[PDB]
Amino acid sequence: KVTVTLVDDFDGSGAADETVEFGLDGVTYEIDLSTKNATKLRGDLKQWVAAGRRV
Amino acid sequence: KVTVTLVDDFDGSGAADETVEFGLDGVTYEIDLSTKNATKLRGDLKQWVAAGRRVG
Structure with missing residues (x-):
């Protein structure tokens, strides 16, 4: 059967x-991620967004 | 005298x-940074840029 899968681009699994x-x-x-990984990416950007300013 | 300087936004003392x-x-x-902190920022995104796909 044809299976179409959305795969997490970061850890490749799931x-x-x-x-x-x-x-x-x-x-x-753009990047496809597990809920866990998207929380990780937003977590990495948190401090830079806080110190930075919207344009 | 008046001084006008670009100050590092991240730690605020440089x-x-x-x-x-x-x-x-x-x-x-946008964020203003020392060369070092700019390296840290780009370093934090490196693995994500690498795994991500460029769009418009």
């Missing part, structure tokens, strides 16, 4: 739960 | 050497 959008140096990215 | 643009969840951000 049913990814969400796609997160993010950016650096004017480049925009 | 001359910023550069301004870095980044984004999360549709929102775009």
Whole structure:
């Protein structure tokens, strides 16, 4: 049978739960992640977003 | 005398050497940083940029 799977781009393992959008140096990215991993990515950006300012 | 200086936003006690643009969840951000802290920022996103896909 044909199986279509949404795979977590970061640890390569499982049913990814969400796609997160993010950016650096004017480049925009998208990434498919488990709930756990998207929490991890937002966690890594937390301190820079706080110190930074919205444009 | 008056002094005008770019101060590192992250720790607040240093001359910023550069301004870095980044984004999360549709929102775009700017931050002024020392060369060192700019390296830390880019370092924190490195694994995520690597696994992610560039879009418009």
